[PDB]
Amino acid sequence: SCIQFTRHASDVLLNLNRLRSRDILTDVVIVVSREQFRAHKTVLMACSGLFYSIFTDQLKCNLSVINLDPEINPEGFCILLDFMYTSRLNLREGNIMAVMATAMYLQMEHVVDTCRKFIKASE
Amino acid sequence: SCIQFTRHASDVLLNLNRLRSRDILTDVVIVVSREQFRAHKTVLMACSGLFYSIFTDQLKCNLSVINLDPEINPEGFCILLDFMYTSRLNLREGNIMAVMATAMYLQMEHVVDTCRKFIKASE
């Protein structure tokens, strides 16, 4: 018999992004080919199967720095990190291949699906 | 020119609640009249003006335990903590006064608004 506030989840995510932009309570640095991205472990886990696996590991959960595979493109990661905190994906002809590869590695199934669909439309 | 994934914010919040239910990466205990509630500081800040003020304070941001005012009802707090992580508010005739008072103290403006409206309808 609960009532539901429609905009609550969107408002929470908007506030989490405001905390990220001001570097408030960020507890991890993600290193991608020498580029560094600060974020909240909980948000990374909530969006990515890879980060979920990493931060539920009894040893890795305590790491303040995570280094991604050197094949990962920093721009592709930046676009996906922005998507995690906003629901908005900056998908362009010039970045779609790097974004899909990064989403496959991060295990972000819905992003992989839209990239596959957009690539299939261009062929 | 971004595309947007409609269910992303809801899916993030659902995963954050799964982390809370399994006590994964919770970093604070909220004490309410001897009852203890584990939560994520970032989610508390994202939902409440009071927690936002507390955890942006240079000294309080480092506290692992926060004690609420003794007038705060533990059931009212539990209902609001559930709302924070789910967007669902268990508002009932028997709890509406305790829920409104707790939401006013926590500075959760949208909850205060619906409680005022539901109380006004009953008079």
Binding site: C2, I3, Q4, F5, T6 | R88, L89, T114
Partner: peptide, 4 residues
């Protein structure tokens, strides 16, 4: 607010 809605009835979910």
């Amino acid at each position: 607010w809605v009835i979910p």
